[PDB]
Amino acid sequence: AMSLENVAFNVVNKGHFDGQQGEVPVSIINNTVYTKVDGVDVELFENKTTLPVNVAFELWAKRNIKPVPEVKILNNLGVDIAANTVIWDYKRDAPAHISTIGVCSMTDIAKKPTETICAPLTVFFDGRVDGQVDLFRNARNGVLITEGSVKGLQPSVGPKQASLNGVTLIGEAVKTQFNYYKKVDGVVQQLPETYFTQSRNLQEFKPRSQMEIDFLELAMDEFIERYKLEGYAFEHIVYGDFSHSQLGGLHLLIGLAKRFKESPFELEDFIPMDSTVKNYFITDAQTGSSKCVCSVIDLLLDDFVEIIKSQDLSVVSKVVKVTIDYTEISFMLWCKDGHVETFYPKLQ
Amino acid sequence: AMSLENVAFNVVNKGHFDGQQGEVPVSIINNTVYTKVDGVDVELFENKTTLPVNVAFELWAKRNIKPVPEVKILNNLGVDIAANTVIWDYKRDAPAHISTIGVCSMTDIAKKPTETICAPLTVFFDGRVDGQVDLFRNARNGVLITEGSVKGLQPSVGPKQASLNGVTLIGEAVKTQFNYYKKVDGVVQQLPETYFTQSRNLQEFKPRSQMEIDFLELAMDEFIERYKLEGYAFEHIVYGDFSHSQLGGLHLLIGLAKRFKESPFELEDFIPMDSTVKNYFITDAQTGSSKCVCSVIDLLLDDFVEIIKSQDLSVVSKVVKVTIDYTEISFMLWCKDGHVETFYPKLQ
Amino acid sequence: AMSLENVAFNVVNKGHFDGQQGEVPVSIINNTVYTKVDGVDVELFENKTTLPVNVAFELWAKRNIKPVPEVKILNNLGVDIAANTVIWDYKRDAPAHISTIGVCSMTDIAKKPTETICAPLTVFFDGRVDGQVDLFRNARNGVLITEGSVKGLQPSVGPKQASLNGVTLIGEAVKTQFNYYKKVDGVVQQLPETYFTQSRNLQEFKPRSQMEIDFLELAMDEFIERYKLEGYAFEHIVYGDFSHSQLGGLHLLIGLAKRFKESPFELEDFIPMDSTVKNYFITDAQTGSSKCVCSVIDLLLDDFVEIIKSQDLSVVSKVVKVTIDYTEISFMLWCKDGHVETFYPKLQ
Amino acid sequence: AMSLENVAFNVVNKGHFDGQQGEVPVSIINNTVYTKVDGVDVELFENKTTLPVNVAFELWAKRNIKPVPEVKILNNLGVDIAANTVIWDYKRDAPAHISTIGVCSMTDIAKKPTETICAPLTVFFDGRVDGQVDLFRNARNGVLITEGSVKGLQPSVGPKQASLNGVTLIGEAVKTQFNYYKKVDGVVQQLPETYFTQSRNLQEFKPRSQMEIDFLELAMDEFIERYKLEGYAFEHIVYGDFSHSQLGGLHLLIGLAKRFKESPFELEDFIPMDSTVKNYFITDAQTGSSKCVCSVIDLLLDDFVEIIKSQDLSVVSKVVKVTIDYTEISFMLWCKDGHVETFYPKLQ
Amino acid sequence: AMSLENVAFNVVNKGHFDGQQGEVPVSIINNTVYTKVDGVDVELFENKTTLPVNVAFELWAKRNIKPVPEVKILNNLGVDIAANTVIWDYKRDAPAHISTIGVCSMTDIAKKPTETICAPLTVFFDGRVDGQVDLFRNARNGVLITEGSVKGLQPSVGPKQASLNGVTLIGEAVKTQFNYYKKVDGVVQQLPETYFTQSRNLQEFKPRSQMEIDFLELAMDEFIERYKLEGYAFEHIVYGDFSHSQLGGLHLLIGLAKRFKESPFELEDFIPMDSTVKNYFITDAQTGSSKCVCSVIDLLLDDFVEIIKSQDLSVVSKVVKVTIDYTEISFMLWCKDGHVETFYPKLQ
Numbered sequence A, B, C, D, E: 001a002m003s004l005e006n007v008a009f010n011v012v013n014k015g016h017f018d019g020q021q022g023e024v025p026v027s028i029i030n031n032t033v034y035t036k037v038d039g040v041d042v043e044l045f046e047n048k049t050t051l052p053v054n055v056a057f058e059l060w061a062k063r064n065i066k067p068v069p070e071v072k073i074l075n076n077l078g079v080d081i082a083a084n085t086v087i088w089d090y091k092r093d094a095p096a097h098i099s100t101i102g103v104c105s106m107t108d109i110a111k112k113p114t115e116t117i118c119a120p121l122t123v124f125f126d127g128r129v130d131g132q133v134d135l136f137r138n139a140r141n142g143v144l145i146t147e148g149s150v151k152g153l154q155p156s157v158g159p160k161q162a163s164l165n166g167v168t169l170i171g172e173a174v175k176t177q178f179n180y181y182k183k184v185d186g187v188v189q190q191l192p193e194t195y196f197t198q199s200r201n202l203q204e205f206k207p208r209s210q211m212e213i214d215f216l217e218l219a220m221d222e223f224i225e226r227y228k229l230e231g232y233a234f235e236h237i238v239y240g241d242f243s244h245s246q247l248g249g250l251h252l253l254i255g256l257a258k259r260f261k262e263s264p265f266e267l268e269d270f271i272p273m274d275s276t277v278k279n280y281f282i283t284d285a286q287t288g289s290s291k292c293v294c295s296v297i298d299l300l301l302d303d304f305v306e307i308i309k310s311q312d313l314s315v316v317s318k319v320v321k322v323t324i325d326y327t328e329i330s331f332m333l334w335c336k337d338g339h340v341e342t343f344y345p346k347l348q
């Protein structure tokens, strides 16, 4: 019994769509939904999507308010659509998926994921919702998350963090670590062994290991001494070189976080979306060092050290493929005389 | 139980809002309402009003589909709002009135016209709706239309024509001639003696008298001979003078209609709204004669002849006030040697 | 090697997309594409679709410029997408189908219809394009049109008319009558026996039989006499009754065409799309007779007479199902004393 | 002698509308007003209102630049319109009122508040403007503010703070505490005894009493000990419970301010407007505790303690009505064994 | 070989336009350019200019990514257009100039600055680009910047700072100090002796001299004592007077920076553009002191002290003209009894 005024009533009275009965007067102008409160219009939703305003408003109101996988993880697993929920992409302020199943009459391709239209699409299933583990078992393509064991199904432990209403966090009052399962053409696939990105911000970066605590506290030459990193080009790769017009390295988020405490810099997010590897046009404010495409990855420093220390350094240039967030990331490894020159997430 | 999807269901299934239950999926883009019909969007309403798209859509769906007074008549009588209906202005493709009573939650100032908010406004009442003659009796300010007698109330016979879904016509299968009543501060007013404009189109003009039949069939000098119009400047005023750069006269719609059969002309309606007197920037295609503001009135030729023949012609210039469509229309009368030079609906 | 400036170059220089090389400067404002011609912007395309302006522009430039099936026929046959072409819906000024195959990078779901994404969709194939009869043979779901015989495939003769650049016509210099074939899950279907709508306009209606020539020339009571139509309510159904406030019958386009020569009327197309049965809110200008939902079908009068004369008239009300344009159209048959009262394409 | 170019001249040259003579070239595109400065367009005003761009621009330029009552106070007193000024709502970036009196030709319902149209509306009068105390005396409905005594009129001391150009503050160089007067139907009404909200921000919260200084400095169990708050559920109500998936209590702004210093949290203002009680969808970043509708009020902790300590605690659940900012706020009081379980501003 | 999809490919893959070959699917909706990434639209550019969206997108992608003169300097020198580059105005998010030369087909007035159309316009030339010093020599009107000497041309040393991707800085890894040259009507003009504004922010203000270090550390009466500023009204002019309703003085950015550390204030930038003298509507949050037009200049305190100490103080009021950023700034000097009362950048 869906309607614009009923979705708006739910937004005004419940903070989101809660299936409540009622209507509030709504007015649509430009790409913004308004409601009349004591004679005047009050903005409820500014549409930043490529969907019609009322359709985007309904999808946002029907967004999942439970901790869910980060959009980069769902994308890396090939999720096309979600079963009976909307995964809201908070970075893009838009639905993570084009179509829906049992959510909105305008975007729905089906009411239930068991409809033959869904068979070729990778449907996201949530084991926390009743019947969705069974729906995953009968779906030809899909990705399932659960809080515990699924009889017979071999699990893949996902990252510790999940997104709750746009806030990435490692849950204390809620579970954020899920078991992951994937199926392609009716067959359960073996999810690869993988590292996970840490999903930290540059402004509120917090070290998550003793190595990371030492990197941020210690000076460059003494940290490299303590962790036996001589010859691995951490000076260029992690710390960054701000001496020439073109900024050198600076590919690990922790390096950007360290630099940020001393002097500010501009990071232009020219493809603003959640992704395992991010690309920024960086301009260092202090020196004027800059780089058009500086690929940045947020790995735990211990994981990055483990990755770089497990490479054969006897070749000038090669592609090193590492599974991170379930996807294969290609790193360009440059060496000279058995020592690393640079190691960066390869720009395709 | 109003909603956008329910108004749209009524539009799609009943042609207008009929109070039916149901919903159809709707999408709003730009200022247009669309509905999904077998996978594709079909336009239902393009907003040409200054109201929000969804609000205009609802008001148009809730328009009065019965023959109603033309907007120029309602305006001339000072109608501010209508009781429990929407008068759709088809010349502007917008609601004739700013607010509503018992129609739409966004535009409603009241649910019933008996609310004290309505007392200072001239409410339009329709005797054809049960209880509205009584509502008019208790309203402080109002305009009432009826098909027959109202006990005690002295009627004012309105024009023969009414607007049915934007089509002005003299009804054969429906009654279009109404009795009119008006109240100002609780007192039933004596509506003045009035002429009525004929509301005819230039393209499909039809004569409504023998004088009008003769005007369109006979040549200029023989019509003026037959009707003793010598010295009344019908050559300039009605027929029009296309000999100089500035078009002479041409203020009566019948004259424009006659000219139209021989050669076409451009009429720029720069204030496109329903009004007793219309103003056009006219460019005659055959001669190139033109005039920025050519005021045009559609009076029955017999009425215009009666008006001009009842004027004292012994003064160079004066204002002749005529009650047309219940309003006072000032005309400018120009004379010389006891004969008319020009007579036009005055530009203020 | 697709681009906005290249599509625009093709539009400006070839009238449509012809695969030519070149670019013209383009500017996009509002929902309109402009091109600079000697210092000033000239409109090329105004987007009336729900797609992004540049995407709609490309699809319209890449429209099929050959006579193709009318959108109502494709819809009735369940066509979801077209193979390597765009069917432009000129009644909606939008693409007939949501997605494309080998046409535009933004709307493409595949490059070739042989991709497994297309298997569950009914793909439209054009025998006039090389290899498309073979593509239809290997497609699981599809609709095929041809100019002649396909070995082994039993044909279904389609209507005489086809749409050429939005102009429906029976071709003299081009073939417009196609053989139709359909497959559901790999099985060649037996297309039902069907009547066809004539797709005529009200303004330029032309009779296509002696019965139709007689209907338009003869008076009501003598036509009904000549064709033994006494007791079939053609007076109400076809001719129309303009005596009461609610317009009676008027469900056959030929009747609207006949009425149109005597007096004009307003037809509000509230669901403006190509369909076998059309619904209009009609207001007769001469009488003021009106009806919110007047279903109108354009059948050849001989076909309508054959349909109504082949019905059992011994029941008050029943649903009469007729295959028209390959689809099942429900009609409502109302009888009394063995005679027809009304027979109209049923409003669901 | 109003004009768009004259309002723009005043904005460019005086920072607001100052009644100066002159014009600057203006261009309107989208919903933004621009001015040409040395060959290029410079944004003057981005319209975020539901009014036409030029109308909103004029109202914003004509905004009151003196300390005025906060919009929540005016709303709580039922103010419909202001006399000869615009109260700009900085939180909504729109005029606080639909219409004006003597301000803008597009929004004006009258030029002077003495016009009969204003009689039924509660007009806001400013005693600091000459003649407005007299206008209030003759107005049927209205709200008056003054800096001192009005002969015969019994005053209501308002809050210490007022809004100056969107900045809420307790004035040192200007008076921000006003006397308030209200009239309904020609009769001066007795304004109730009321508490006042403190209007503080979460990010720049400052304690305004020794109790508040102790709440922010002291730990939970020692503050409750010092102020004899045992059994009043301040642990749940003020401090907040972040242990379960649903966040417990957290209804006093000071509690949110204390929590904010330790760890951040998201507050979704889903009805973004000035109001005595605010509703937020809160997501605690540290724990993942969340609540869809967390009603938040900014009372001085001493006032909240006085309110909760003056309640009978011998009932399971009841509505406690408290006058705050002149309006009656309903609080839901939940008790068990003579002790408080929760006390929150009741969600209607 | 320019195209929208090629500019977008360059933005996605290089961070800006780099002349690379390739295309990415693009969609334009509203005034925003999007690209499809794994099924969903990702925003590439939100148009805030008065140019068409695709044109602004191309100009922004083709922006100069090298340290360039700040827009205020180019404006002060009368620059109309740039040679074969786009100077992006980051404060206005728009191109600094209306037209281009050899950049975009929509905005280009010429391909090379040697075309007679450019002769009357002051073209900006960059000596760092090959052939541009020669182009300047043959241009009738122009402004040239270089890193070193130009044979025969007498240089003007510009400011230390330049804008790199919107970041104003004094370069360490890149040169930001340029030599400036100007030509009017084929004749090299002598650039005047000039002071330079420091281009500092209020939030991240840093002292650039011992006098500035002392101003920020020392109290008002002791700083004035140390620098012999008694009688120069620094208390009013630089420190600001927040005691009356109208804020006194506060015309030097360093004064606003000092005040900012103690208490916050609102600065309304009503003409948001880069300029030597800025105008703000300031509201002090602590006191409620305010001023509609507070002209603010960021001079090094030593330079401002030198300017004010080099004035004759024996007149009530006079205009003091000082060349700053190459332009003549008029200062209003008010004196009494041989002492300064106020000294502010005169509001024209």
Ligand SMILES: Cc1nc(C)c(CN)[nH]1
Binding pocket: A044, A045, A046, A047, A048, A060, A090, A093
């Ligand atoms: C997360 C979110 N909420 C809203 C109201 C939006 C629209 N910009 N986005």
Ligand SMILES: Cc1nc(C)c(CN)[nH]1
Binding pocket: B044, B045, B046, B047, B048, B060, B090, B093
């Ligand atoms: C009379 C009318 N019908 C419609 C669908 C409109 C919107 N332009 N106006």
Ligand SMILES: Cc1nc(C)c(CN)[nH]1
Binding pocket: C044, C045, C046, C047, C048, C060, C090, C093
């Ligand atoms: C058939 C058609 N041509 C054009 C240029 C359009 C856009 N309204 N539609």
Ligand SMILES: Cc1nc(C)c(CN)[nH]1
Binding pocket: D044, D045, D046, D047, D048, D060, D090, D093
């Ligand atoms: C307070 C305010 N000033 C302006 C220019 C606006 C428009 N967003 N709002």
Ligand SMILES: Cc1nc(C)c(CN)[nH]1
Binding pocket: E044, E045, E046, E047, E048, E060, E090, E093
């Ligand atoms: C500097 C800049 N980049 C972009 C994507 C814009 C559009 N707002 N402006």
